[PDB]
Amino acid sequence: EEFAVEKIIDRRVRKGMVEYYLKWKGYPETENTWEPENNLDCQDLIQQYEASR
């Protein structure tokens, strides 16, 4: 159940754990989901998001 990530939309902390709001490649924006940081294999996207905030 791993899927291609298009971009990181947002970031939050919930219950002490960092979560990223993801747009999934090839899926509509209605399918965007919040995922815990350890669910991601997107070092390029994460570093770009964190550098750009």
């Binding site: 159940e1 791993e2 990530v5 993801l22 999934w24 991601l40 294999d41």
Partner: peptide
């Protein structure tokens, strides 16, 4: 550039 979807 992938992620697990919970």
């Amino acid at each position: 550039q992938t992620a697990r979807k919970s």
